[PDB]
Amino acid sequence: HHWGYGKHNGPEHWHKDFPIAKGERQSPVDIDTHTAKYDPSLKPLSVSYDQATSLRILNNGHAFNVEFDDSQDKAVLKGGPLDGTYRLIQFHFHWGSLDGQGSEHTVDKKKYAAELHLVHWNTKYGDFGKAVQQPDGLAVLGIFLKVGSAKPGLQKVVDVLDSIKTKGKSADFTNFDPRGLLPESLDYWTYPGSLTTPPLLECVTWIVLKEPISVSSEQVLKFRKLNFNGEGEPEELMVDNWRPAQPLKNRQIKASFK
Ligand SMILES: [Zn+2]
């Protein structure tokens, strides 16, 4: 027994093992575009992924992560509302069983087909494990996916999914360029929050891009063929691995654009 997205162990049950689930800065949240405050003091985002070194792709039972070498400042995120350098460690997605759901954050209550999270940790803390224990330890870049035209830069990920169908399976995944997953504009919303999966630590500075990227129905369909279960166990399709919106509470969402 453990946490998951089922009916008996889903998000509504998490608070029993992880009390922080009912915390003051939980994520995701609904972004109300008319309540969001334009902050002219926000600097443009600085994404430097030219030297990125991807290593592996893993199905961890609740999603699939594409891991990167974070032993040096290769792929970093700076600027925006951040102070210091944040290193890319991995990226993963959240998706639904239908195109009408899948994203964790919503915009004016609108749900997207999926949501991409590029996770980075503040280098002043030494390692990822120490970073999560700090209020400014992580910076997560969130990108919405809508169904439409295919995204060429996403196909390499899609094609390797059959090799990591079940929990615990991993595959060599080198030379992948995450720049192919970025939208044209880097306009964003930002607010203080947390990880959206246990341990739900409140150590994240969220940076959600306004512009979604388009992926084809065939691409997102291949995500839905993954399994929550491990090999040799009853097959449970990996779908609807998203946490619903949490109360905003004493927080303000800021926008880098008007
Ligand atoms: Zn995530």
8 marked ligand binding residue: no
3-state helix, strand, coil in the chain (%, to 5): 15, 30, 55
Ligand 1 centroid to residue 28 C-alpha, Å:
9
Q: Which CA distances in Å does 212 have to 8, 123, 215?
A: 32, 28, 10
Residues around ligand 1, an ion, CB closer than 5 A:
117
**Dihedral angle sign, alpha carbons of residues 205, 209, 210, 215:** negative
**Dihedral angle sign, alpha carbons of residues 155, 157, 163, 164:** negative
Hey, what amino acid is at 95? W
- The DSSP bridge pattern shows strands 254-255 and 37-38 to be parallel
Whether residue 62 lies in the annotated active site: yes
33 marked ligand binding residue: no
Q: Cis omega (within 30 of 0) on the bond before 199?
A: yes
Residue 26: partners with Cβ closer than 8 Å, 6 or more residues away: 20, 193, 194, 200, 202, 246, 247
Beta bridge partners of 78: 46
92 marked ligand binding residue: yes
Q: From CA 95, how far away is CA 112, in angstroms rounded?
A: 9
Q: From CA 143, how far away is CA 182, in angstroms rounded?
A: 8
DSSP-assigned letters across all residues of 61-114: SS-EEEEE--SSSSSEEEETT--S-EEEEEEEEEE-SSTT---SSEETTB--SE
Ligand 1 centroid to residue 196 C-alpha, Å:
6
Do 123 and 139 touch, CB atoms closer than 8 A?
Answer: no
Point out the catalytic residue in the list 8, 13, 34, 62: 62
Ligand 1 centroid to residue 136 C-alpha, Å:
17
| Domains of the chain by start residue, with CATH | 1-258 (3.10.200.10)
Hey, what amino acid is at 110? K
Do 66 and 173 touch, CB atoms closer than 8 A?
Answer: yes
Q: From CA 48, how far away is CA 54, in angstroms rounded?
A: 14
197 marked ligand binding residue: yes
